[PDB]
Amino acid sequence: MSEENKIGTYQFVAEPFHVDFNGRLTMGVLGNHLLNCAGFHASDRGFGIATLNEDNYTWVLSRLAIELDEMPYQYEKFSVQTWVENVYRLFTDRNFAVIDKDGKKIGYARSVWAMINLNTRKPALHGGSIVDYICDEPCPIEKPSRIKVTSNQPVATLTAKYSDIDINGHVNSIRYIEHILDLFPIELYQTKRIRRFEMAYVAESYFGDELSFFCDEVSENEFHVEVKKNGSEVVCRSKVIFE
Protein backbone atom coordinates (compact mmCIF):
# COMPACT_ATOMS: atom_id res chain seq x y z
CA MET A 1 0.00 0.00 0.00
CA SER A 2 1.39 3.42 -1.09
CA GLU A 3 1.74 6.40 1.26
CA GLU A 4 -1.08 8.25 -0.55
CA ASN A 5 -3.25 5.10 0.00
CA LYS A 6 -3.09 5.40 3.83
CA ILE A 7 -4.75 8.86 3.69
CA GLY A 8 -8.48 9.29 4.09
CA THR A 9 -10.04 12.24 2.22
CA TYR A 10 -13.49 13.59 3.09
CA GLN A 11 -15.59 16.22 1.31
CA PHE A 12 -17.65 18.95 2.96
CA VAL A 13 -19.56 22.16 2.27
CA ALA A 14 -19.52 25.09 4.76
CA GLU A 15 -23.19 25.40 5.87
CA PRO A 16 -24.81 28.71 7.02
CA PHE A 17 -25.35 27.60 10.62
CA HIS A 18 -21.72 26.51 10.81
CA VAL A 19 -20.10 29.88 9.99
CA ASP A 20 -19.46 33.05 12.01
CA PHE A 21 -20.45 36.65 11.44
CA ASN A 22 -17.65 36.99 8.82
CA GLY A 23 -19.08 33.94 6.94
CA ARG A 24 -16.12 31.68 7.85
CA LEU A 25 -16.36 28.17 9.24
CA THR A 26 -16.21 28.22 13.01
CA MET A 27 -13.36 26.53 14.91
CA GLY A 28 -15.84 24.34 16.78
CA VAL A 29 -17.32 23.04 13.50
CA LEU A 30 -13.86 22.46 12.03
CA GLY A 31 -12.88 20.49 15.17
CA ASN A 32 -16.13 18.48 14.74
CA HIS A 33 -15.17 17.63 11.13
CA LEU A 34 -11.56 16.66 12.08
CA LEU A 35 -12.69 14.34 14.91
CA ASN A 36 -15.43 12.74 12.79
CA CYS A 37 -12.87 12.19 9.99
CA ALA A 38 -10.49 10.52 12.40
CA GLY A 39 -13.34 8.21 13.31
CA PHE A 40 -14.30 7.46 9.67
CA HIS A 41 -10.67 6.67 8.85
CA ALA A 42 -10.06 4.42 11.89
CA SER A 43 -13.40 2.61 11.65
CA ASP A 44 -13.10 1.86 7.99
CA ARG A 45 -9.71 0.28 8.65
CA GLY A 46 -10.62 -1.61 11.82
CA PHE A 47 -8.75 0.32 14.50
CA GLY A 48 -11.49 2.60 15.74
CA ILE A 49 -13.36 2.71 19.02
CA ALA A 50 -15.71 -0.19 18.09
CA THR A 51 -12.81 -2.62 17.49
CA LEU A 52 -10.86 -1.47 20.55
CA ASN A 53 -13.98 -1.82 22.77
CA GLU A 54 -14.32 -5.52 21.90
CA ASP A 55 -11.01 -6.06 23.74
CA ASN A 56 -11.77 -3.65 26.57
CA TYR A 57 -9.81 -0.64 25.36
CA THR A 58 -10.86 2.73 24.04
CA TRP A 59 -9.34 5.87 22.52
CA VAL A 60 -9.27 9.20 24.34
CA LEU A 61 -8.38 12.53 22.78
CA SER A 62 -5.62 14.23 24.77
CA ARG A 63 -4.40 17.12 22.59
CA LEU A 64 -5.55 18.96 19.42
CA ALA A 65 -3.65 21.74 17.53
CA ILE A 66 -5.12 23.46 14.45
CA GLU A 67 -3.13 25.96 12.37
CA LEU A 68 -4.78 27.87 9.51
CA ASP A 69 -3.91 30.36 6.77
CA GLU A 70 -7.65 30.77 6.13
CA MET A 71 -10.98 29.14 6.94
CA PRO A 72 -13.56 27.98 4.36
CA TYR A 73 -16.32 30.48 3.45
CA GLN A 74 -20.08 29.94 3.62
CA TYR A 75 -21.24 27.52 0.90
CA GLU A 76 -17.72 26.65 -0.30
CA LYS A 77 -16.58 23.11 -0.71
CA PHE A 78 -13.65 21.99 1.32
CA SER A 79 -12.02 18.74 2.28
CA VAL A 80 -10.13 17.10 5.09
CA GLN A 81 -7.31 14.58 4.73
CA THR A 82 -6.20 12.53 7.72
CA TRP A 83 -3.63 9.87 8.43
CA VAL A 84 -1.74 8.21 11.27
CA GLU A 85 1.74 9.65 11.71
CA ASN A 86 2.93 7.57 14.68
CA VAL A 87 1.77 4.79 16.94
CA TYR A 88 3.73 5.08 20.16
CA ARG A 89 3.48 2.83 23.24
CA LEU A 90 1.12 5.19 25.07
CA PHE A 91 -0.22 7.51 22.35
CA THR A 92 -1.14 7.74 18.67
CA ASP A 93 -0.49 10.90 16.66
CA ARG A 94 -3.11 11.52 13.97
CA ASN A 95 -2.58 14.45 11.57
CA PHE A 96 -4.82 16.39 9.25
CA ALA A 97 -4.68 18.72 6.24
CA VAL A 98 -7.55 21.06 5.28
CA ILE A 99 -7.97 21.75 1.58
CA ASP A 100 -9.95 24.65 0.15
CA LYS A 101 -12.31 24.65 -2.87
CA ASP A 102 -9.34 25.24 -5.24
CA GLY A 103 -7.30 22.33 -3.86
CA LYS A 104 -4.93 24.59 -1.94
CA LYS A 105 -3.82 23.44 1.52
CA ILE A 106 -5.18 26.11 3.87
CA GLY A 107 -4.44 24.48 7.22
CA TYR A 108 -3.15 21.55 9.23
CA ALA A 109 -4.01 19.83 12.48
CA ARG A 110 -2.25 17.47 14.91
CA SER A 111 -4.14 15.27 17.41
CA VAL A 112 -2.77 13.03 20.19
CA TRP A 113 -4.87 10.11 21.43
CA ALA A 114 -4.33 7.80 24.39
CA MET A 115 -5.49 4.16 24.50
CA ILE A 116 -6.85 3.15 27.90
CA ASN A 117 -8.10 -0.06 29.45
CA LEU A 118 -11.81 0.33 30.24
CA ASN A 119 -11.80 -1.70 33.48
CA THR A 120 -8.94 -0.03 35.27
CA ARG A 121 -8.96 3.30 33.36
CA LYS A 122 -5.24 2.66 33.01
CA PRO A 123 -3.22 3.63 29.97
CA ALA A 124 -2.32 1.03 27.29
CA LEU A 125 0.16 -2.86 19.82
CA HIS A 126 0.20 -5.06 16.81
CA GLY A 127 -2.45 -7.79 16.47
CA GLY A 128 -4.42 -4.90 15.02
CA SER A 129 -4.31 -3.07 11.77
CA ILE A 130 -3.22 0.43 12.90
CA VAL A 131 0.52 -0.04 12.35
CA ASP A 132 -0.13 -0.87 8.70
CA TYR A 133 -1.41 2.70 8.17
CA ILE A 134 1.53 4.71 9.59
CA CYS A 135 2.09 7.34 6.95
CA ASP A 136 4.83 9.89 6.22
CA GLU A 137 2.58 12.64 4.75
CA PRO A 138 3.89 16.07 5.86
CA CYS A 139 2.15 18.19 8.49
CA PRO A 140 4.47 21.19 8.87
CA ILE A 141 3.12 22.64 12.13
CA GLU A 142 4.49 22.55 15.70
CA LYS A 143 3.32 19.68 17.89
CA PRO A 144 0.96 20.65 20.69
CA SER A 145 2.52 20.52 24.18
CA ARG A 146 1.63 21.39 27.79
CA ILE A 147 -0.04 24.78 28.20
CA LYS A 148 0.82 26.95 31.21
CA VAL A 149 -1.84 29.26 32.78
CA THR A 150 -0.77 31.47 35.72
CA SER A 151 -3.94 33.52 36.44
CA ASN A 152 -6.16 32.37 39.34
CA GLN A 153 -8.86 35.02 38.84
CA PRO A 154 -11.78 33.77 36.74
CA VAL A 155 -12.98 35.94 33.86
CA ALA A 156 -16.23 34.06 33.29
CA THR A 157 -18.43 31.26 34.68
CA LEU A 158 -20.93 28.95 33.00
CA THR A 159 -23.04 25.98 34.10
CA ALA A 160 -22.92 22.81 31.94
CA LYS A 161 -26.33 22.35 30.26
CA TYR A 162 -28.31 19.78 28.28
CA SER A 163 -26.84 21.06 24.98
CA ASP A 164 -23.28 20.50 26.25
CA ILE A 165 -23.56 16.80 27.09
CA ASP A 166 -22.74 13.80 24.91
CA ILE A 167 -23.79 10.15 25.11
CA ASN A 168 -21.28 9.41 27.90
CA GLY A 169 -22.74 12.13 30.07
CA HIS A 170 -19.89 14.55 29.77
CA VAL A 171 -19.34 17.93 28.24
CA ASN A 172 -18.20 17.21 24.74
CA SER A 173 -14.86 18.16 23.18
CA ILE A 174 -16.40 20.66 20.76
CA ARG A 175 -18.55 22.43 23.31
CA TYR A 176 -15.42 23.37 25.24
CA ILE A 177 -14.04 25.00 22.06
CA GLU A 178 -17.23 27.06 21.58
CA HIS A 179 -17.27 28.27 25.19
CA ILE A 180 -13.57 29.26 25.12
CA LEU A 181 -13.95 31.18 21.86
CA ASP A 182 -16.93 33.04 23.40
CA LEU A 183 -14.54 34.66 25.90
CA PHE A 184 -12.98 36.97 23.29
CA PRO A 185 -14.24 40.44 22.39
CA ILE A 186 -16.02 40.80 19.12
CA GLU A 187 -13.54 43.58 18.05
CA LEU A 188 -10.86 40.85 17.97
CA TYR A 189 -12.89 38.71 15.57
CA GLN A 190 -13.65 41.84 13.52
CA THR A 191 -10.00 42.77 13.06
CA LYS A 192 -8.06 39.52 13.41
CA ARG A 193 -8.43 35.83 12.83
CA ILE A 194 -7.31 32.84 14.82
CA ARG A 195 -4.18 31.40 13.20
CA ARG A 196 -3.43 28.76 15.82
CA PHE A 197 -5.71 27.05 18.28
CA GLU A 198 -4.83 24.32 20.77
CA MET A 199 -6.89 22.23 23.20
CA ALA A 200 -5.66 19.99 26.01
CA TYR A 201 -8.34 17.73 27.49
CA VAL A 202 -7.51 17.08 31.09
CA ALA A 203 -10.63 15.77 32.84
CA GLU A 204 -14.38 15.45 32.42
CA SER A 205 -17.25 17.77 33.31
CA TYR A 206 -20.85 16.71 33.84
CA PHE A 207 -24.30 18.27 33.61
CA GLY A 208 -24.77 20.95 36.25
CA ASP A 209 -21.04 21.50 36.89
CA GLU A 210 -19.93 25.16 37.16
CA LEU A 211 -17.16 25.81 34.71
CA SER A 212 -14.88 28.77 35.48
CA PHE A 213 -12.54 30.26 32.88
CA PHE A 214 -9.11 31.71 33.55
CA CYS A 215 -7.02 33.55 31.04
CA ASP A 216 -3.41 34.82 30.65
CA GLU A 217 -2.76 37.18 27.74
CA VAL A 218 0.88 36.39 27.09
CA SER A 219 1.23 38.91 24.23
CA GLU A 220 -1.21 41.10 22.30
CA ASN A 221 -2.18 38.09 20.17
CA GLU A 222 -1.59 35.03 22.37
CA PHE A 223 -3.95 33.85 25.08
CA HIS A 224 -3.72 30.87 27.39
CA VAL A 225 -6.97 29.64 28.88
CA GLU A 226 -7.71 27.18 31.66
CA VAL A 227 -11.20 25.82 32.36
CA LYS A 228 -11.89 24.48 35.88
CA LYS A 229 -14.91 22.68 37.30
CA ASN A 230 -16.47 23.40 40.65
CA GLY A 231 -13.70 25.82 41.58
CA SER A 232 -10.56 23.75 41.64
CA GLU A 233 -10.20 20.93 39.14
CA VAL A 234 -8.77 21.65 35.72
CA VAL A 235 -10.83 20.10 32.92
CA CYS A 236 -9.08 21.63 29.90
CA ARG A 237 -6.53 24.16 28.74
CA SER A 238 -6.30 26.06 25.49
CA LYS A 239 -4.00 28.28 23.53
CA VAL A 240 -5.41 30.81 21.04
CA ILE A 241 -3.15 32.79 18.74
CA PHE A 242 -4.73 35.59 16.70
CA GLU A 243 -3.29 37.57 13.82
Residues of this chain that bind Cl ion (CB under 5 A): 15, 18, 43, 48, 50-51, 146-147, 200, 237
Answer with the entry of its own copies, Cl ion, Ca ion, none that 21 interacts with (C-beta below 5 to 8 A by kind). Answer: its own copies
Characterize 151-182 residue by residue with b for buried, 16 or more Cβ atoms within 10 angstroms of its Cβ, and e for exposed.
eeebeeeeebeeebbeeeebbbbbbbbbbbbe
Longest dimension (CA), the chain: 53
Reference 25, options 197, 183, 160, 145; nearest CA is 197
Amino acid at 93: D
As a whole number of angstroms, the distance between CA 145 and CA 112 comes to 10
Does 216 sit near its own copies (CB under 8 A)?
A: no
- Please check if 166 is assigned to a binding site: yes
Q: Nearer to Cl ion by C-beta: 43 or 159?
A: 43
Does 157 sit near its own copies (CB under 8 A)?
A: no
CB within 8 Å of 53: residues ≥ 6 apart:
118
| Minimum distance, C-beta of residue 164 to its own copies, in the bound complex (Å) | 9
Does 3 sit near Ca ion (CB under 5 A)?
A: no
Answer with the entry of its own copies, Ca ion, Cl ion, none that 51 interacts with (C-beta below 5 to 8 A by kind). Answer: Cl ion
Does 178 sit near its own copies (CB under 8 A)?
A: yes
As a whole number of angstroms, the distance between CA 200 and CA 142 comes to 15
Q: Which parts of this chain interact with its own copies (CB under 8 A)?
A: 15-17, 19-23, 26, 28, 32, 35-36, 39, 74, 161-163, 165-167, 169, 172-174, 178-179, 181-182, 184, 186, 189, 207-208
